[PDB]
Design a protein around this ligand. Structure first.
Ligand SMILES: Cc1cc2c(cc1C)N(C[C@H](O)[C@H](O)[C@H](O)COP(=O)(O)OP(=O)(O)OC[C@H]1O[C@@H](n3cnc4c(N)ncnc43)[C@H](O)[C@@H]1O)c1[nH]c(=O)[nH]c(=O)c1N2
Length: 455
DNA sequence: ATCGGCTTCGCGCA
DNA sequence: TTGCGCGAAGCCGA
């Protein structure tokens, strides 16, 4: 393993006991540098590797849809880990408390976790650090080039990150070893209980009939790879031409798996690189999963208020402020956005895509969030509404991409200045008519308009 | 220096 | 829907 995938979080004496992979972001047994490394030090100690996952209370802030997707992924993982003799333990609680204690109870010799740039994980790490004496390591298993290694600063734009990361691709883009099994020697309950809790918040149609359709994306490591393979076969070739058209099912459809780490984004790049397809489509796509994905961890990692106005660039803040008193053509409440009650059938169409498939089309997410900004009482509130709807109803939400994408859409993070307008300042503008020139808006509206049947 | 060149724009034009 | 050119606009970096 390239040792620059590892960082020390805390020194100390190695216990004579097992090596505990604190799985958190990368919920997969295959193509997992964090697990691979864990096993490897457990090989140099002749002690076994275990995996522990913290079932936290944060699931009460999103929906059954996310929770179901994830827990079902885990149930398949625990098998997959058993087949390699790697036991899988599931603590129910707060990880500061629970990881440190489990390190005590199970006499852990070394602790490894994966890398996540989100505020909460660094809170939990600092808490764990205090409550343990053993070595504590971190492995960037979610990015091709480790976040702290790709750049040491916040990147103004993709066109400054991109040389930086392409300079390290040859060293860090590589194949994955095999996960060697342990030489040395309930989840079904937790899903029922939790789903029982989330129920009175479930999004329902006027007939007690749930809104979310669960069959557009089956959860798990297995399903993820079939989605990847069916994308290389059927959709990569058209990607460059149709990635901006919401009427074509032509995206990878990988983001819900990428968020939970049910698949390695590295493996996707490995497969796509070798795929003999249209160059235009490869280059566009590598650009999204490599650059736009990893600049998002970059933003969150170097900007701890990544869900705040104050991480917008100076020009964008100064511009939005100077338009705070402009008359808005419309103002909607979070309740109104949430239910698709704006003047715009295109905007509602896209919210109905979000409510029912739990995944909104890429291009329409940009439109979606810029219109939240344009028809709410203030920047701050637009951001709140946007974040809240993103994270409540996207299978891929609560994720650095989400934040960096909302920040792109509303504060121009990683963008530039455009014509100065009412309300939205010099933020890039997107128009109903611009869409109508780019795709059959009326199809998209057709498909979802019909969901005026909400509780 | 200093100046090209930026995700994902809009819009007229052919 | 098509692609092309041009507009408006702030700032990084070779
Ligand atoms: C307002 C808003 C809101 C969101 C997002 C963007 C915007 C503008 N995105 C980012 C992007 O829209 C989303 O990753 C894709 O639409 C996911 O669908 P596919 O995987 O099919 O995309 P597609 O196959 O076209 O792209 C492949 C992968 O590239 C990455 N990617 C694509 N567009 C990106 C972008 N603009 N920024 C960062 N990475 C990008 C993702 O990892 C994605 O899975 C996001 N993404 C996410 O993971 N979680 C979220 O909650 C959101 N929410």
């Amino acid at each position: 393993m390239n040792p620059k995938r590892i960082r020390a979080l805390k020194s100390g004496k190695q216990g004579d006991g097992p090596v505990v992979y604190w799985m958190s972001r990368d919920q997969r047994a295959e193509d997992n540098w964090a697990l691979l490394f864990s096993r490897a030090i457990a090989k140099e100690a002749n002690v076994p590797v275990v995996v522990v996952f913290c079932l936290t209370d944060e699931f009460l802030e999103a929906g059954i849809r996310q929770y179901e997707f994830m827990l079902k992924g885990l149930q398949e993982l625990e098998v997959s880990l058993s087949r390699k003799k790697i036991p899988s333990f599931f603590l129910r609680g707060d990880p500061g408390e629970k990881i440190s204690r489990f390190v005590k109870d199970y006499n852990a010799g070394t602790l490894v976790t994966d890398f996540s740039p989100l505020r909460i994980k660094n809170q939990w790490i600092e808490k764990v650090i205090s409550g343990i004496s053993i070595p504590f390591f971190e492995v960037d298993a979610h990015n091709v080039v480790p976040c702290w290694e790709a750049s040491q600063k916040h990147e103004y734009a993709a066109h400054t990150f991109r040389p930086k990361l392409y300079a390290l691709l040859p060293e860090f883009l590589e194949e994955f070893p095999e996960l060697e099994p342990n030489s040395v020697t309930t989840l079904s309950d937790v899903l029922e209980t939790g789903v029982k809790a989330l129920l009175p918040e479930r999004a329902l149609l006027k007939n007690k009939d749930p809104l979310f359709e669960p069959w557009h994306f089956e959860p798990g490591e297995k399903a993820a790879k079939k989605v990847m393979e069916s994308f290389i076969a059927d959709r990569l070739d058209s990607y460059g031409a149709l990635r901006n058209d919401p009427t074509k099912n032509m995206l990878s459809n990988l983001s819900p798996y990428l968020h939970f780490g049910q698949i390695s984004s590295q493996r996707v790049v490995l497969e796509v690189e070798k795929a003999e397809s249209n160059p235009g489509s490869k280059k566009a796509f590598l650009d999204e999963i490599l650059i736009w994905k990893e600049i998002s961890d970059n933003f969150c990692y170097y900007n701890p208020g990544y869900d705040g106005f104050e991480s917008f660039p100076s020009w964008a803040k100064e511009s939005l402020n100077a338009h705070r008193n402009d008359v808005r053509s419309h103002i909607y409440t979070l309740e109104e956005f949430e239910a698709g009650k704006t003047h715009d059938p295109l905007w509602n169409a896209s919210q109905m895509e979000l409510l029912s498939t739990g995944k909104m089309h890429g291009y329409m997410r940009m439109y979606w969030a810029k219109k939240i900004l344009e028809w709410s009482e203030s920047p701050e509130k637009a951001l709140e509404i946007a974040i809240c709807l993103n994270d409540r109803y996207e299978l891929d939400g609560r994720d650095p991409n989400g934040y960096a994408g909302i920040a792109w859409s509303i504060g121009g993070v990683h963008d530039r200045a455009w014509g100065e307008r009412e309300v939205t300042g010099k933020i890039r503008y997107m128009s109903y008519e611009g869409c109508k020139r780019k795709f059959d808006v009326k199809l998209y509206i057709e498909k979802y308009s019909a969901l005026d049947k909400l509780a």
